[PDB]
Design a binder for this molecule. Structure first.
Ligand code: APC
Ligand code: YH7
Ligand code: MG
Ligand code: MG
Length: 160
């Protein structure tokens, strides 16, 4: 049973362009899974402490037959491969962040997983790249991505 998972990518440490390229190769190496498409690379000012570098943000469509937490096990390996240091606070810098934004049309609320990503509808740097690869996207609650964007004051992003 194949599902399309949409994954958000963020990086602002240790050459983000290399970090993201490495993440994309590794994402394709996930078993029972392959990349359908990927957005452009965007350069975004940090949401959080201002004394950190600008981010490279992107979105990826990953077709997969894995269970959601099985996929999470793989995306977390990828973060560690790129030296991600796990921390409690979540707005600081990192080599690589891989978040599952959407997993098919599923709503997931477990100890390890909240899908749709709890804050994605409030982050231009997640929505704009997603819109690039899925302009007709509809969230599980039925809102359209396009309507959200063109309705709220999301400044457009600059490319990397
Ligand atoms: N949709 C999702 N994708 C990835 N991880 C998720 C998730 N929902 C919950 N999590 C959980 O979030 C935990 C911490 O992940 P972190 O990457 O350190 C938070 P972050 O991405 O830096 O900030 P954010 O969640 O505000 O985007 C993971 O161990 C994972 O279990
Ligand atoms: N704090 C932040 N974390 C991640 S993963 N991506 C960002 N883009 C702009 N700010 C960001
Ligand atoms: Mg994140
Ligand atoms: Mg994360």
């Amino acid at each position: 049973h194949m599902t399309v998972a949409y994954i958000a990518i963020g990086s602002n440490l240790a050459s983000p362009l290399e970090q993201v390229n490495a993440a994309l190769k590794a994402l394709g190496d996930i078993p029972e899974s392959h990349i359908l498409t990927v957005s452009s690379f965007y350069r975004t000012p940090p949401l959080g402490p201002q004394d950190q570098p600008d981010y490279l943000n992107a979105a990826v469509a990953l077709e997969t037959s894995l269970a959601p937490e099985e996929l999470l096990n793989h995306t977390q390996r990828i973060e560690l491969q790129q030296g991600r240091v796990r921390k409690a606070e979540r707005w600081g810098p990192r080599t690589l962040d891989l978040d599952i934004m959407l997993f098919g049309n599923e709503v997931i609320n477990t100890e390890r997983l909240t899908v749709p990503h709890y804050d994605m509808k409030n982050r231009g740097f997640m929505l704009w790249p997603l819109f690039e690869i899925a302009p007709e996207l509809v969230f599980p609650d039925g809102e359209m991505l396009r309507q959200i964007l063109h309705t709220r004051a999301f400044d457009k992003l600059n490319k990397w």
